[PDB]
């Protein structure tokens, strides 16, 4: 039984942490209403009294009001919502002293849940950014319009990265096949300042274009074999597993 | 006859593990409502009291409330859903002490 703690200004406002394993003691004197609210954005679902007729129930939104309607109103109240279920113990007080005008909750369970998901996200991001056992190809050459050129080009065996300076526009990058024809290759823009374009393919030749200026980039150490993608992700330390089963 | 086991902060909240081959003894006192809490994703099909008049029944989704409405209300409540069927042995306790505000289930 959770006895709430009164505020230091007045005894009629009390506080208690929510606990899904313990009920809160509410002491109601005759002729007053105990104002109760729920945490912001909480969907009120249903409520149940021990005596529907001994107490009243007024609710609009998240604000809940009760009041004793009958002599000797000693029952409970179970207010169920979408995330939790408040269990009260209502004990009508005979001598009309030490009333409650407001019950307020401080919720540690929601924080304990919100923190775990951050831990899971951090774990997966750590797995992805744990990049280890990587080999880097730097044998890249270029010819053409050097005013749209990257300051660095390399590949890690799976993706090719073109690094552009801060004052440079990011151009379009095209895949060149053996006959010399260009074709679209998907890209993602990475880096702290979005200065790297990472294309999702390793190729012997690339075409860069910005307006009427073209730069050709050649991979001089092209490895046809590559590193096979056994895991279904971009790293060998994370696995894409079937969830649908089916 | 699995009697539910209370929490360590209060006895008004009990817990029980589900078992399709055993009933759950429910101890009801006068003037309290019992929040019986079902598993998520579970759809209610049908329930059948031992006496419809000995208890009040309310259900919203998977929440269940039962509350004695007559004296000597010793019956059984069998609620059947898609995944499983629950069994309760409702037994009214005359002393108005040691109620069970919430019954929470566990599943192996």
């Amino acid at each position: 039984l959770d006895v709430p703690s009164s505020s230091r200004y007045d005894h009629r406002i009390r506080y208690v942490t929510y606990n899904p394993a313990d009920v809160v003691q509410v002491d109601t004197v005759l002729g007053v209403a105990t104002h109760i609210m729920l945490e912001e954005g909480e969907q009120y679902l249903t409520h149940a009294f021990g005596d529907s007729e001994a107490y009243a129930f007024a609710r609009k939104g998240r604000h809940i009001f009760i009041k004793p309607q009958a002599e000797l109103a000693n029952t409970n109240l179970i207010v169920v919502t979408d995330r939790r279920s408040y269990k009260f113990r209502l004990q009508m007080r005979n001598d009309r002293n030490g009333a409650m005008y407001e019950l307020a909750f401080r919720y540690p369970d929601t924080q304990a849940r919100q923190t775990r998901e951050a831990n899971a996200r951090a774990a997966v991001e750590a797995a992805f950014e744990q990049r280890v056992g990587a080999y880097y190809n730097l044998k890249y050459m270029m010819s053409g319009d050097k005013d749209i050129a990257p300051v660095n080009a390399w590949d890690d065996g799976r993706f090719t990265y073109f690094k552009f300076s801060a004052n440079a526009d990011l151009p379009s990058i095209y895949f060149v096949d053996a006959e010399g024809n260009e074709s679209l290759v998907p890209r993602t823009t990475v880096g702290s300042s979005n200065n790297i374009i990472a294309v999702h393919k390793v190729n012997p030749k690339w075409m860069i274009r910005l307006g009427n200026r073209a730069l050709a980039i050649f991979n001089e150490a092209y490895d046809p074999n590559g590193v096979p993608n056994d895991t279904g992700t971009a790293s060998p330390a994370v696995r894409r597993v079937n969830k649908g089963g089916n | 006859l699995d009697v539910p086991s209370s929490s360590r902060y209060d006895h008004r909240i009990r817990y029980v593990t589900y078992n399709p081959a055993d009933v759950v003894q429910v101890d009801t006192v006068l003037g309290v409502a019992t929040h019986i809490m079902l598993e998520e994703g579970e759809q209610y099909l049908t329930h059948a009291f031992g006496d419809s008049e000995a208890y009040a029944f309310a259900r919203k989704g998977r929440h269940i409330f039962i509350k004695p409405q007559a004296e000597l209300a010793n019956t059984n409540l069998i609620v059947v859903t898609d995944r499983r069927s629950y069994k309760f042995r409702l037994q009214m306790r005359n002393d108005r002490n040691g109620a069970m505000y919430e019954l929470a289930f566990r599943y192996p």
């Binding site: 009958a70 000797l72 | 004296e71």
Partner: peptide
């Protein structure tokens, strides 16, 4: 009808 008896009646009647 003592008040406690009326309280028990209210407990049994209400929903």
């Amino acid at each position: 009808k003592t008040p406690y008896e009326l309280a028990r009646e209210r407990m049994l009647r209400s929903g």
